[PDB]
Sequence to fold (1363 residues):
Amino acid sequence: SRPAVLSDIQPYVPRYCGNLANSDAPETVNKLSVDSKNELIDTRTMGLGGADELTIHSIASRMTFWRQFDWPESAVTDTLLASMSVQPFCIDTVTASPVTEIHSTALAFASAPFETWQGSIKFHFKVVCSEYHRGRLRLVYNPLTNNAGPVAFNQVYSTTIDISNDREFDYECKWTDIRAWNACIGIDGATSATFFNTAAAVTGGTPFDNGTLSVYVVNELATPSTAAADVKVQVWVSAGDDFAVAVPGVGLSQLSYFQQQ
Amino acid sequence: SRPAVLSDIQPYVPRYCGNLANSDAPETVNKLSVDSKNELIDTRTMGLGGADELTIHSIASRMTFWRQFDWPESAVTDTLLASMSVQPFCIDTVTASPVTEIHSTALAFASAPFETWQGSIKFHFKVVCSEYHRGRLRLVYNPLTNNAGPVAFNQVYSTTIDISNDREFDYECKWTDIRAWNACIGIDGATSATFFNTAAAVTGGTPFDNGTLSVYVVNELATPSTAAADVKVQVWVSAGDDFAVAVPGVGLSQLSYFQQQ
Amino acid sequence: SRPAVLSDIQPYVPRYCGNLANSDAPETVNKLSVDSKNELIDTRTMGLGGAD
Amino acid sequence: DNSNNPVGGNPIDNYGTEHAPLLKEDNQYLVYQGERIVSFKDLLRRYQYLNSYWPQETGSGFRYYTLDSPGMPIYRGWDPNGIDQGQDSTAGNSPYNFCSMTLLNYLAPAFVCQRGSLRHKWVTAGARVNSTASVLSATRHGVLFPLPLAETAHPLDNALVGDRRSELQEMQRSRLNGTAITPVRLNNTLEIELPYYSIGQRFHASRFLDLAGTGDTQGVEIACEISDGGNDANYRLDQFVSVGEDFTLGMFVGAPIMYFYNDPTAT
Amino acid sequence: DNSNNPVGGNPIDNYGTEHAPLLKEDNQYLVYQGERIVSFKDLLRRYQYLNSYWPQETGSGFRYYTLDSPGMPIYRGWDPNGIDQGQDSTAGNSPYNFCSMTLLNYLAPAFVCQRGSLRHKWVTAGARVNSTASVLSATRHGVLFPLPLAETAHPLDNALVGDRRSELQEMQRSRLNGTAITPVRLNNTLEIELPYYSIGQRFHASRFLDLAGTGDTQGVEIACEISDGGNDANYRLDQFVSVGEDFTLGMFVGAPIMYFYNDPTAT
Amino acid sequence: EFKHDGLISKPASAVAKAADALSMIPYIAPYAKATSMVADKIGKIARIFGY
Amino acid sequence: EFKHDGLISKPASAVAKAADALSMIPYIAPYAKATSMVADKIGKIARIFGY
Amino acid sequence: EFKHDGLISKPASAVAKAADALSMIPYIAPYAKATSMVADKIGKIARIFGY
Amino acid sequence: EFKHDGLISKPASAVAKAADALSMIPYIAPYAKATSMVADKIGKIARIFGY
Amino acid sequence: EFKHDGLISKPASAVAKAADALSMIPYIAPYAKATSMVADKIGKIARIFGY
Fold:
């Protein structure tokens, strides 16, 4: 109370509710502890190894089984076995009349809160067969869609793997789109669209995906006897090295972990 | 909660609405993104060259076609062909009884939000004729107005261009006014006044313009045959190097991009 | 929103009407111009000699 | 010999000895103006009043007014898709916007491209009842579907608490998108900025006039509680628009066709 | 020869010369997005609206509303132990939560372990009567007994002052645990953080969905005064949840089974 | 850029006698932002162009 | 860490041209906190991982 | 000029013993403003004339 | 002591690895206050005893 | 004098062991004010006399 404060009048704006949109601004939060700097650690004191696993690329790069198809005896050259859409949202549903279960890949789990995606998608194909089952598969990449008959060896991107030396193999579909970022359908929107057809070719070319990847037969399946051979192929799916997501959105506002009742 | 805060009481004034008049004060704005420093660039990533084009002098210096007049066979020495007012607001209207279109020069576009202007105006004259059409034009600058008859070669500023060597030529009308800044009529106010007359001389000397520029005939149009020759001259208009605008005002509060209904 | 602000609670007194008696204190005045430092001069640009 | 130049240019002897003499006057703005205006990007960062919005015109009871507005200000005149209705020249009626002509609305249809963040202020003037503790909130929409300018009311005065919660979950405020809230009794001003998110888009059409019937990809939902009692009939929201810092316009392709007329009688 | 690898991996020649070309575009987010999102731990620190709570639904007279809520947000769908009641597919009724699906609720049942502090905001929107000077208060519970989500009213308008004091001593606000108070007429926002105290526990079950019927060991009691007069029927509390700075999740064991459906009619 | 009390250190509106370079064109570097860029890379007076 | 005006000194959201190390894994020291730790012990750009 | 807490560094009202130069005339340079000018170009005590 | 923003410069609550001297007794000088004293005269970690 | 946060740098109330010069008389210079004067011209402890 002796002198007079001659500092300048300093303007201010009150922020009662704070800053609840940005992810990096410090907060004026009354922590309900004794020490103001009360803080634990985030390490291998839970029994684990110590790796940060809330990275988007650490969750999405996990190779997860997605679907399975078969390669019949009656398949001949230029027969489509499966066709699938190049995108993150690789789910599979189990309906049972009141409930509808949605089983999602880690690639589809880690990309649901977002509205744009880009990058490469890795598909791991796994042929279950004996040593005496021989043939050639063929992996068409087509940015739009495949025609209703045979697909020519020119005018598409293809690989033609022999399954004698490589029964299991992965194929990385890079970014070849006219945009930089495609849209995200969400797990909510992927449950109504066809993304794995195995009877015809799926419809790509949408603003939501990066085209389509299809499996054809080049050489027929050779058999060691007269027994009926039921050969299957497994499709596992992961994120490639380019894979990025952006625009946090409303993709998971309608999802739930409780069944439909 | 251990010690007591013995800093001075510091006076403040709350600013709830902010500062919405000045153009340089920082703002306390809650940006609705994840990163507080979310910012794109402003460059040639749109397909362009990378030049800053929101400069007033970059918009206003573009040479834009304004009007067109003719130079008849019956024109003789000291015949006025056109007279125009030296100012930024060079527009042209198309009426069709409910609607009234206003087509404005980039010089008139870039000077509508302001209330004062100064500087030089550049007029580009472009004579459309064959190689056998010869004569002399004459460009009077008069700060007030030209008399109803012939204008003398003394007592005005004039040039007398021969159109044999220079069929296209521009003429820069500098600042010769009793003020430093003239007023801006606006595009709203330029639609009711006469700024290009081509039958008499326009009225300058107002506080809104920098005088008047007129075109007279010195030597008659020479013709190669007995055919009727319809020679025209085009007036293009731009800002000179001196051109400046100030006092942001209410010049575009009544304008619209939707027709009159 | 990552850390917690651990600066001290700083006391203040609001001054809504300002300081309208003293002749030397700076003011928090919203000047109605484009430039915040909008200022002319006070000299012989009025036709005069330049004396205060 | 410089005789069909698309930009012209052939300087003939004019009436001055000294070329461009007003650039050599250094202390000119110490005498007349006090400041110099060189760019529009400096002048586009002054806020300007766009339009006002009355929340007690949509629902009934105590409810939650929500307004889906574009991030870019709507245009000033006789729309075919206008949010208001004016008396035209045939003594009839036509759609009309009673909004202001901002500098952004003026400059944007003369350029091809457009990109950048856009800043808003929501001011909440008028009258109000003494029993209010509402929160004004701004929350952004997605960038796939542009919603047009629309007004919705969500009722909050049901007998069931669950049927109030189901109305609070129909709102964009409940979502993972960026949200700014404030109390009206304490601050009543948002001061938000809409960033330029896009589905692989480098720019958008700067010459797109139909923002009130289509919207853009920077839309925002503004939300505020309202009651049906009197003296809330004068409660309104004022929108002030301006331009963020990463904002740019494309190539200049000339001024559009303009029209000059006053506001008609609102019917 | 890499032929039963549990993670797969055998790169066959695909259709690109350049491997992973989108990592070599350094200035990509100067063109399209403005920002890059790499981790979820950065994105979990955005607050998101969880649920609203109406204090004039529990007691009568002038009283003190108290709400025992978990520190972790409750889950979104058809609980067997839900706090609300919706109309199901058999045209009957079933318990249901009308809360939002936050990013924390999304990410947590896909991990085994969970540890860290959790941040809350309590916003207090709606209407109110002019005769209020209430104090909103948050106070933490013990870490031995997790209390479920419950609502209680303590009457304060008795004739005896001692029987008012005995109601103020039935509250967790009167205890040695950490308490944050604020006046509703002046700030109306708490912004608290619940630390991770534990009885020798290194983590807890991140796949535990029944938070509304059991609670967790980071529960908090929220307390606010309410009167029985009208215009307080619209007085409510909004909960915004987020994640503290010592927060971590354990090992990823896959996404759970998900379900997609809109909110039913609240009955 | 984002600095504490940046309006004090500007010439900010006006004459600033060496700020009569209004006839100069601003050069934008190939991925230049507006904030932590050309206002410090062109010169002192690049804040009259809005940077 | 707990410092005065720490958001000004971040690159904080974005490109920050040398911040294209998104393909790097964060290493956590055996008893590392989040605040006064790996955001200064990995590098300048360890704040895009949330530290 | 526009500086932070400029009233503290003034003599600001009064005697300031060397401020008995009230009999001196203030000289204004030919395009001098009032703010970033003669209050620092005449002397320390040019703030009793209002500059 | 009475200093500006003293909570930032504390370890203030916790582990602070060298703050495992909880088995040490605090020594109080014969006329020591709590504020401008033993929190700086014992060591850095004398603030977990309440000083 | 008029300085920013002057109460922090005082001993301000009390013992301040060298402040047992209460038996000393304050000397006032012939035109000394109270503010920018004898509180700095007598000694450190001239603030218990009210200066």
Remarks:
- The first strand of chain D starts at residue 48 and ends at 53.
- Residues 1-267 of chain D form one domain.
